């Protein structure tokens, strides 16, 4: 099963040995970028080209061999077995990116600086294989979809209104050297975008007291609506992290997992009248409904075993215990009134 051993190393690294390999690859890729940056500078333009030639000729070969080895090793999983299974694996976006960058590098070396410079940037997207960072950020953003839309909409509306008012108050003022700064609505909007994001290049500043008053009343209120998404997302991340300390231990969910599968199979097996499950004649109609109920009960019980602890489980536990003790107490009661 050396195929799975190779696939674990290339696709699913966990050890320090694989960490060193990935770190080396990432640092080689990063070193590649720096020499590209220095090539645009006129002083270092000459030598950088010849250095980059010999760097690229080996880096395209290194990445090309790695891709075909990765593709072959992907067949160990039953999800990708077979020719169509492997074609399903190449459908993944990361494999598409790798294929595109390899083919583009080969074509570029066959024949343009604006292309190789962009390719050496796209190569940075290789380091992350499993897509964990996107898989986390997307979920966290999707949970809070409403408030982000609300704050962005309100901030955009405030920017649109305030910029027009400032343009109205400022379009007739001359600068010190002499150039109408707010000569059009586009310039006022460019000023507004700079101020809401608290950058403040200082290339455009209001000149009249009306504009200064409007900007002063505008900044203290509309600035908060653009620093709010970070405050929402950070708190969301922290709260999500906190739940990791209250996980139900993985060892205790096994019986529910077995029960779900067994009940599902038993519900399916009723379709064959000669199946051995009948060995435990109109009663079969009620038997099917009983198994149908049991399937839903098992499915409901499975989901609760994968969630963190909550007060609802305490309430349910007390509910079950109370009636259990109650019926036993009533039984003892009846045993006493027998005499």
């Amino acid at each position: 099963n050396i195929q799975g051993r190779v696939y674990n190393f290339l696709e699913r690294p966990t050890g320090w040995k694989c960490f060193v390999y990935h770190f080396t690859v990432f640092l080689i890729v990063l070193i590649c970028l720096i020499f590209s940056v220095l090539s645009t500078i006129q002083q270092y333009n000459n030598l950088a080209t010849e250095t980059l030639f010999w760097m690229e000729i080996v880096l395209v070969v290194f990445f090309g061999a790695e891709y075909v080895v990765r593709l072959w090793s992907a067949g160990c999983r039953s999800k990708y077995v077979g020719v169509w299974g492997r074609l399903r694996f190449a459908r993944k976006p990361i494999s598409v990116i790798d294929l595109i960058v390899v083919v583009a590098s080969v074509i570029v070396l066959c024949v343009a600086i604006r292309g190789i410079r962009f390719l050496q940037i796209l190569r940075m997207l290789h380091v992350d294989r499993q897509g964990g960072t996107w898989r986390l950020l997307g979920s966290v953003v999707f949970i809070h979809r409403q408030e982000l839309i609300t704050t962005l909409y309100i901030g955009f509306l405030g920017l649109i209104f305030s910029s027009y008012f400032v343009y109205l108050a400022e379009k007739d003022a001359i600068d010190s050297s002499g150039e109408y700064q707010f000569g059009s609505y586009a310039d006022a909007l460019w000023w507004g975008v700079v101020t809401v994001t608290t950058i403040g290049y200082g290339d455009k500043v209001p000149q009249t007291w009306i504009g200064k008053t409007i900007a002063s009343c505008f900044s203290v209120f509309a600035i908060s609506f653009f620093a709010l998404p970070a405050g929402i997302l950070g708190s969301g991340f922290a709260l999500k992290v906190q739940q990791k300390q209250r996980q139900k231990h993985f060892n205790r969910q096994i019986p529910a997992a077995a029960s779900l599968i067994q009940t599902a199979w038993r519900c399916y097996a009723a379709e064959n009248p000669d199946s051995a499950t009948w060995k435990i004649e109109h009663h079969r109609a009620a038997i099917k409904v009983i198994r149908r109920m049991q399937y839903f009960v098992a499915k409901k019980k499975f989901q609760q075993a994968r969630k963190p602890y909550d007060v609802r489980d305490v309430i349910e536990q007390y509910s079950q215990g109370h009636l259990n003790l109650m019926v036993r107490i009533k039984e003892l009661q009846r045993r006493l009134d027998q005499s």
């Binding site: 160990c76 039953s78 019986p255």
Partner: protein, 137 residues
């Protein structure tokens, strides 16, 4: 269409128009299952749509109208198998599957397990592809 009246009336022995815990327990005991009060409680709760503690006929139609082969339910069965897969590769040993299905949970009898192992594991070798097995079911 609407043949469920017969089954609903069979469950509703006293004919009040609803299905209570006592009737369900009596029907189960007629089959020799001997459940506890708690199991009947969850079984009735899982169907109850008006939150009264009993089962009405339209709720019976609503429950019977549900169907399997929905992705939201197929993913549950897929996740259930992955608990026992030591590698997530989509393969499980026949002996481990037999031991798990016999010695845990509902504890099926050997005859059901044997029919299952022939309905699946067409590969015949040491590892069984459970993905197609879930797909068939």
């Amino acid at each position: 269409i609407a043949e469920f009246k017969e089954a609903f009336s069979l469950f509703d022995k006293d004919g009040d128009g609803t299905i209570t815990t006592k009737e369900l327990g009596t029907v189960m005991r007629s089959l020799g299952q001997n459940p506890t009060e708690a199991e009947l409680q969850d079984m009735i709760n899982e169907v109850d749509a008006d939150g009264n503690g009993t089962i009405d006929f339209p709720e019976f139609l609503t429950m019977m109208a549900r169907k399997m082969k929905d992705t939201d339910s197929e993913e549950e069965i897929r996740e259930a198998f992955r608990v026992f897969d030591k590698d997530g590769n989509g393969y499980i040993s026949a002996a481990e599957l037999r031991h798990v299905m016999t010695n845990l949970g509902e504890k099926l009898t050997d005859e059901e397990v044997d029919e299952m192992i022939r309905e699946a594991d067409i590969d015949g070798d040491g590892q069984v592809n459970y993905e197609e097995f879930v797909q068939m079911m």
